[PDB]
Design an enzyme around this catalytic site. Sequence first.
Site, PDB file in Angstrom:
ATOM      1  N   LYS A 158       5.112  -3.313   8.286  1.00 57.55           N
ATOM      2  CA  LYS A 158       5.820  -2.240   7.752  1.00 57.55           C
ATOM      3  C   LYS A 158       7.290  -2.965   7.869  1.00 57.55           C
ATOM      4  O   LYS A 158       7.769  -3.187   8.653  1.00 57.55           O
ATOM      5  CB  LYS A 158       5.848  -1.084   8.867  1.00 57.55           C
ATOM      6  N   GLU A 206       8.339   0.299   3.370  1.00 54.15           N
ATOM      7  CA  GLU A 206       7.355  -0.149   2.721  1.00 54.15           C
ATOM      8  C   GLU A 206       6.301  -0.628   3.619  1.00 54.15           C
ATOM      9  O   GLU A 206       6.526  -0.857   4.876  1.00 54.15           O
ATOM     10  CB  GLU A 206       7.545  -1.484   1.794  1.00 54.15           C
ATOM     11  N   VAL A 207       4.748  -0.351   3.423  1.00 50.30           N
ATOM     12  CA  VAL A 207       3.733  -0.935   4.140  1.00 50.30           C
ATOM     13  C   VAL A 207       2.760  -1.893   3.395  1.00 50.30           C
ATOM     14  O   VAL A 207       2.651  -1.605   2.178  1.00 50.30           O
ATOM     15  CB  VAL A 207       2.820   0.197   4.814  1.00 50.30           C
ATOM     16  N   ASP A 257       5.120  13.089  16.324  1.00 48.84           N
ATOM     17  CA  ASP A 257       5.060  13.065  14.856  1.00 48.84           C
ATOM     18  C   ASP A 257       3.590  12.792  14.565  1.00 48.84           C
ATOM     19  O   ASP A 257       3.146  12.187  13.516  1.00 48.84           O
ATOM     20  CB  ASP A 257       5.907  12.140  14.105  1.00 48.84           C
ATOM     21  N   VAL A 294       0.954  -1.082   0.026  1.00 45.78           N
ATOM     22  CA  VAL A 294      -0.026  -0.110  -0.062  1.00 45.78           C
ATOM     23  C   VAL A 294       0.857   1.172   0.031  1.00 45.78           C
ATOM     24  O   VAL A 294       0.193   2.545  -0.030  1.00 45.78           O
ATOM     25  CB  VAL A 294      -0.980  -0.258   1.058  1.00 45.78           C
ATOM     26  N   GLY A 295       2.229   0.890   0.078  1.00 46.52           N
ATOM     27  CA  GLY A 295       2.925   2.435  -0.124  1.00 46.52           C
ATOM     28  C   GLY A 295       4.559   2.003   0.270  1.00 46.52           C
ATOM     29  O   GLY A 295       5.084   1.128   0.676  1.00 46.52           O
ATOM     30  N   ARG A 329      10.691   7.063   1.506  1.00 43.91           N
ATOM     31  CA  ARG A 329      12.167   6.931   2.113  1.00 43.91           C
ATOM     32  C   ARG A 329      12.130   6.012   3.208  1.00 43.91           C
ATOM     33  O   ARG A 329      13.305   5.825   3.852  1.00 43.91           O
ATOM     34  CB  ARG A 329      12.474   8.377   2.551  1.00 43.91           C
TER      35      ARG A 329
HETATM   36  C1  LIG Z   1       2.332  -1.561  10.462  1.00 44.81           C
HETATM   37  O1  LIG Z   1       2.887  -0.480  10.932  1.00 44.81           O
HETATM   38  C2  LIG Z   1       2.332   0.517  10.921  1.00 44.81           C
HETATM   39  C3  LIG Z   1       1.204   0.587   9.559  1.00 44.81           C
HETATM   40  C4  LIG Z   1       0.709   1.908   9.444  1.00 44.81           C
HETATM   41  C5  LIG Z   1      -0.285   1.923   8.008  1.00 44.81           C
HETATM   42  C6  LIG Z   1      -0.271   2.659   7.135  1.00 44.81           C
HETATM   43  N1  LIG Z   1      -1.041   2.826   6.039  1.00 44.81           N
HETATM   44  C7  LIG Z   1      -0.800   3.467   4.913  1.00 44.81           C
HETATM   45  C8  LIG Z   1      -2.369   2.004   6.121  1.00 44.81           C
HETATM   46  O2  LIG Z   1      -3.026   1.971   5.211  1.00 44.81           O
HETATM   47  C9  LIG Z   1      -2.284   1.076   7.346  1.00 44.81           C
HETATM   48  C10 LIG Z   1      -3.745   0.219   7.499  1.00 44.81           C
HETATM   49  N2  LIG Z   1      -3.840  -0.353   8.347  1.00 44.81           N
HETATM   50  C11 LIG Z   1      -2.942  -0.639   9.602  1.00 44.81           C
HETATM   51  C12 LIG Z   1      -1.760   0.221   9.486  1.00 44.81           C
HETATM   52  C13 LIG Z   1      -1.774   0.900   8.405  1.00 44.81           C
HETATM   53  C14 LIG Z   1       0.919   2.939  10.172  1.00 44.81           C
HETATM   54  O3  LIG Z   1       0.218   4.489   9.717  1.00 44.81           O
HETATM   55  C15 LIG Z   1       1.045   5.110   9.052  1.00 44.81           C
HETATM   56  C16 LIG Z   1       2.047   3.271  11.263  1.00 44.81           C
HETATM   57  C17 LIG Z   1       2.543   1.701  11.399  1.00 44.81           C
HETATM   58  C18 LIG Z   1       3.636   1.725  12.666  1.00 44.81           C
HETATM   59  N3  LIG Z   1       4.907   1.952  12.378  1.00 44.81           N
HETATM   60  C19 LIG Z   1       5.422   1.199  11.169  1.00 44.81           C
HETATM   61  C20 LIG Z   1       5.183   3.360  12.466  1.00 44.81           C
END
Ligand SMILES: COc1cc(-c2cn(C)c(=O)c3cnccc23)c(OC)cc1CN(C)C
Length: 296
Positions: free
Chosen positions: A32, A18-19, A133, A11-12, A15
Amino acid sequence: VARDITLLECVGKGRYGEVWRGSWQGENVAVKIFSSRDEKSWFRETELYNTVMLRHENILGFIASDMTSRHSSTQLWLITHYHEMGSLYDYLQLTTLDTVSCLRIVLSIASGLAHLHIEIFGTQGKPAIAHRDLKSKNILVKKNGQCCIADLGLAVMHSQSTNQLDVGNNPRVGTKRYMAPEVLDETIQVDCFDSYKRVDIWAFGLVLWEVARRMVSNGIVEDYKPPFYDVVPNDPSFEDMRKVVCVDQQRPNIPNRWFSDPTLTSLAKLMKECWYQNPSARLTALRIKKTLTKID
Ligand SMILES: COc1cc(-c2cn(C)c(=O)c3cnccc23)c(OC)cc1CN(C)C
């Protein structure tokens, strides 16, 4: 548990890393994969979730942290619950909000933030935590219309028993667009935990503004815009933000149409009380939560 994860959809990518939407035990999870340059965020976020009881309906639910190997190199994974609706930032650009939907969103953010900011003692205890943040990209939308706050990779902790302030060793800084003036002018008092809470409040006020623009009243709405869209470019610089926020002391404009709706009238008052140049004058997250409980 990373070995038992199948990455279903990315989904992303940026820098930071990736998520991915993944499956674990046949269940949706968010993964993540941190970039090489951001291992200290992985460390700090793993540290928060493993050492503090952070269960709360409005804080992103942690599942696991792991190191794995891909392409003959180390990957650092953080795994959380999955929220189909994605980020508040993306959500606000895809839909408008009615009064109930808008208030449910902002109250849920206030409740998550107040839970972070307060220290609890006893069996349900937690240190006080500041986020550092906060922004609409770091907020997820749940199916019931509330939100949850995400990303503890910059979090600062404080505990009254020791009077110990635990800042990270993370060289990452907050998103510049959302930095309060005392961060941009570098006069923030770094050894006082309240300073970090007041930085969160400044950023929350900006998010309040972002969300309220998308609430319909009199059949009209504002387009989604990020804070300071009209005075700084994309990926603004430190100089860009400091000139706007510190010198010219500019704040996001209130659209005139908010004053023909009782709810957006009160929200405008609330968000201004988060934007005082003097940090000690800003409302606390608990006060914001109390007020948002009273609107409507
Ligand atoms: C998995 O870890 C994370 C995921 C997301 C996350 C992003 N996006 C775009 C999503 O659609 C999403 C959808 N479901 C659950 C989570 C996310 C997150 O929000 C920015 C923060 C962390 C925490 N950390 C790595 C900082």
